[PDB]
Design a protein around this ligand. Sequence first.
Ligand SMILES: CC(=O)N[C@@H]1[C@@H](O)[C@H](O[C@@H]2O[C@H](CO)[C@@H](O[C@@H]3O[C@H](CO)[C@@H](O)[C@H](O)[C@H]3NC(C)=O)[C@H](O)[C@H]2NC(C)=O)[C@@H](CO)O[C@H]1O
Ligand SMILES: CC(=O)N[C@@H]1[C@@H](O)[C@H](O[C@@H]2O[C@H](CO)[C@@H](O)[C@H](O)[C@H]2NC(C)=O)[C@@H](CO)O[C@H]1O
Length: 185
Amino acid sequence: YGDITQVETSGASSKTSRQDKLEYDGVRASHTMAQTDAGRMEKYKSFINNVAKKHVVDPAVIAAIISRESRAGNVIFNTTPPGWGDNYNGFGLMQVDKRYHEPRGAWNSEEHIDQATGILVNFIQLIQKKFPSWSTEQQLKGAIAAYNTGDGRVESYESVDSRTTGKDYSNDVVARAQWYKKNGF
Ligand SMILES: CC(=O)N[C@@H]1[C@@H](O)[C@H](O[C@@H]2O[C@H](CO)[C@@H](O[C@@H]3O[C@H](CO)[C@@H](O)[C@H](O)[C@H]3NC(C)=O)[C@H](O)[C@H]2NC(C)=O)[C@@H](CO)O[C@H]1O
Ligand SMILES: CC(=O)N[C@@H]1[C@@H](O)[C@H](O[C@@H]2O[C@H](CO)[C@@H](O)[C@H](O)[C@H]2NC(C)=O)[C@@H](CO)O[C@H]1O
């Protein structure tokens, strides 16, 4: 769907990087945050594999979104009820936003991952129609950015993250995905 290994990235902003108490930012910070979540990520392997097969999306991209969205459950396992974020709008491992989609499945379920990964695919389709001459890698990064901010707030490739949380969402998610691709979980 575009090739994640060829997407350019500047990784995590300093703000994002700070929250893991890191003294550095950027791609190395993304790698470290991805590595932090890799153990928790193992629990969801059957599900991530199944869904990646169904949507034809790299499991590293799914895993990167799980890491960025909820730290593979670390910051949502204990809300009430469990599985909630973004007050109280984001549901599950991948933080499906209830305002736009009815959240399906248990917070940590295959059904949930399926939904959220389908949402990403819909954004890949939307960004390919919006910028059909961007490269497929630019398109995939825009789709990831849209997963956070809407395809309506992805205006250019250089400013792809300018309207995202932390101004770094697709930059970070891409770097984490690159880590998971290279290292596995
Ligand atoms: C290892 C660990 O648990 N570290 C915790 C930090 O991850 C956590 O920082 C906050 O992390 C959450 C999850 O990444 C961030 O919230 C998410 O933000 C994305 C957009 O980027 C949004 O789409 C998700 O819905 C949302 N999920 C939830 C559950 O709200 C949040 O923005 C981070 N906060 C900041 C200031 O960066 C910190 C607490 O901040 O605790 C660490 O232990
Ligand atoms: C994972 C998730 O739920 N992502 C959210 C986006 O869906 C959402 O963008 C909105 O997506 C809908 C497509 O299903 C569109 O109807 C709507 O046009 C679109 N919003 C914009 C501004 O383009 C965004 C909105 O910021 O939030 C995400 O959390």
